[PDB]
Structure formats: C-alpha cells, structure tokens
Structure 1
Amino acid sequence: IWGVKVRLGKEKDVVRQILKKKLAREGTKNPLEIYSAFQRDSFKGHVYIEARKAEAINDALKGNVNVFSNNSKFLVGIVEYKDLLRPVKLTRGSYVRVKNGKFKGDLAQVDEVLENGLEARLKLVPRLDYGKDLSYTSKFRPAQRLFSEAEARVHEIRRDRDGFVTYGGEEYYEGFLYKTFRLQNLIVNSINPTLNELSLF
C-alpha cells in the first residue's frame, strides 16, 4: 500500500474517482492494477491503494485535480498495514452535554435512547422567559431555571400527569426539560464539570 498526499477535504472525492476510473477501464488494454483502496477519517489527506507496483498507483492518481500533484508517497510496514485498516460508551443515566440549537452548552441526563438508535432523549434545564419576548438564537439565551408550574400559570398550557406539563411540544418533568435530541448534537465523553453544575448537581 502507498499513501500519496491528496487535496484537503477532497479525499473521498479522490476515492470515488479511483473507483469509477477502475470500473470504466476494466477490460481495456490499459486497466488500473489495484486491489483495494481506502481513506480513514483520522488519516485525512492520505490516500491508500492496494497494489504491487508504484506505476499502478501513479495511474490511479494521474488525471485527478482533487490530489496534490506531488508523488509524496510512502510505504507501510507489515505490522502497520492492519493499523491503517483498524476502524478504532453511550449509557442512559450518565450526564452528557448539548452542542447544538439554543440550549447548547447545558449538561443533561439521557432519558431514553430510541429503539433504532438515532435520537437520544435528554433531561435538560428549561430556559424560559415566561412569554416576555414572544413575538430563538444561540447568542440571546437568558439565564436558566427549572420549570415552575406556579410561575408558568401566573405569568403565562395543559396537565397530563402529576408533575408533568406539556408546553409548546416540550416536556417538563420535575422542573427538568425532556426533549428528543439527535445523537449528533451531543457528546457523552470529554466532559469536565463546571462550578454551576457542582453547586446544583
């Protein structure tokens, strides 16, 4: 396998070019002599093709503008070959954070992971103005507070259970926000608790 540098961000495009030119030249008198090629997310900008002679690699990369023209290629050790093809903790009840939407930057507890595994429910802290400026964005969010039925009724509605209130499609259970959340919007690892979390949580 040889790793030839390619243009930043266009590595999957280069992979597609390799595959499609390999398909189109098959059976001709000048086919592409390759076996298998891959790109890994960690190895960004690196294009790996399985072959036996550097001429095949040059042919594969020749004619691509999505590649750095230089033949900055290198070999891979026997033990290192499996490393390039080695691909490489989400549990309910553990605390995770949000990184998307208008509640981003707030620690939350998972309530339920969907059966398919595409949306993960969370236990967030509502950020409610109680209808003061209803007429949002991740730069104008005011302070945070637990949902209060009394204050919510006083200032601004349906009750389905004792302690559960449905407000604008959002779920408030024991003063904590429940909502469906995409798994791409959250991270379960690399969390250092903050001072406010210690004071409250």
Structure 2
Amino acid sequence: DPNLWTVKCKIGEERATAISLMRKFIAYQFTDTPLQIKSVVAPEHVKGYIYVEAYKQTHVKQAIEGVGNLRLGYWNQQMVPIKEMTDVLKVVKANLKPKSWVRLKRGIYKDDIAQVDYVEPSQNTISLKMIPRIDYDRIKA
C-alpha cells in the first residue's frame, strides 16, 4: 500500500495550496515530467501543515519543486507510522443544521449560547434565537 508523507506549509493557507497543487497536476500530467503523487489530505481542524500520499520521499521531493509556498518544508520530509493512516480522516462533531445551538463572537451577546431557527439558501445571513439583554433605554443617556 502507498505511504503518507508530511510537508510543512504556512499558517492559514491550506485550500489555496490544495487548489494550486491540483492546477499544477492537471497542467503537468500530459508532459514528460508528471507527478507521481496519489492524494493530499488537508483537514479543516489542522492549520499549519498539509499531508501528501506517495511511496517514496523522492517523489514528493521532486513534485513540490518550483512552488513558492512549500519552500519552507522542503529540506525535511517526515514519515508517520502506518497506524496513523486512519485517524487523520476522523472528524469530531459542516456544523450547519437548523434547530441547533450555536455561539456568537462579535456583537454584544459575546460568549453566549443561542439557537438557530431558519437558514437562508443564499449563504449570506442566518437567523438566530436569543433573549435580549438591553436595559430598555432607562440607564443610558
């Protein structure tokens, strides 16, 4: 079975790296220098490095040449055991379902639990249930 290798990357750029790699593979697949990579895993919970699937280290070493994003993680290629070939794909509870409880960060109701009512298909705004905390305009000027 193929092996899974690890390569360092910048913090906050994981989907961009994935799409760039996809574009490079699609653009350099009918040439004399194809990429032997099988697949790359970019979990959402992790942020700071990405994974890559390949048999040998030379494959990914020669496959990440020229890219300016993976330059940092180019002089070291770590190998993980075979037991770690299934925990990377695990996800602990996406996270968008009506009639569920969610919390807020900005606004005035900071660090408070709420409840979802309706979701707009436009993916721009979503309703929310919460009890008001204002003073009803009696204390403020």
Distance 2:100 2:5 in 1: 45
Picking from 87, 90, 93, the partner of 1:86 is: 90
Question: What residue in structure 2 maps to residue 104 of structure 1?
Answer: 109
How many residue pairs get aligned? The number is 129
Equivalent residues of 2:40, 2:51 under 8 A apart: yes
Distance 2:73 2:111 in 1: 46
Q: Which runs of 4+ in 1 moved over 3 A?
A: 89-94, 106-109, 115-118
* DSSP-derived class of the 2:17 partner: helix
AA in 2 matched with 1:78: I
Picking from 97, 122, 126, the partner of 2:129 is: 122
Shift of 1:113: 2.3
Shift of 1:126: 4.0
Shift of 1:32: 0.4
Equivalent residues of 1:18, 1:60 under 8 A apart: no
Q: 1:71 to 1:39 in 2, by over 3 A?
A: farther
With a CA cutoff of 8 Å and minimum separation of 6, indicate the structure with the bigger relative contact order.
2
TM-score by length of structure 1 reads: 0.53
Shift of 1:125: 1.6
Q: Which is strand-richer, 1 or 2?
A: 1
Deviations 1:8-34 (A, max 9, x none): 222322222211111111121110001
Picking from 38, 48, 54, the partner of 1:51 is: 54
Q: 1:2 to 1:129 in 2, by over 3 A?
A: same
Question: Could you list the runs of 5+ residues in structure 2 that have no partner in the other structure?
Answer: none
TM-score by length of structure 2 reads: 0.71
Distance 2:58 2:32 in 1: 15
Distance 1:61 1:26 in 2: 14
Deviations 1:100-143 (A, max 9, x none): 22x23264553x5226687242122242437x76xxxxxxxxxx
Q: 1:22 to 1:126 in 2, by over 3 A?
A: same
Give the structure with higher Rg (CA): 1
Give aligned-pair identity as a percent: 27
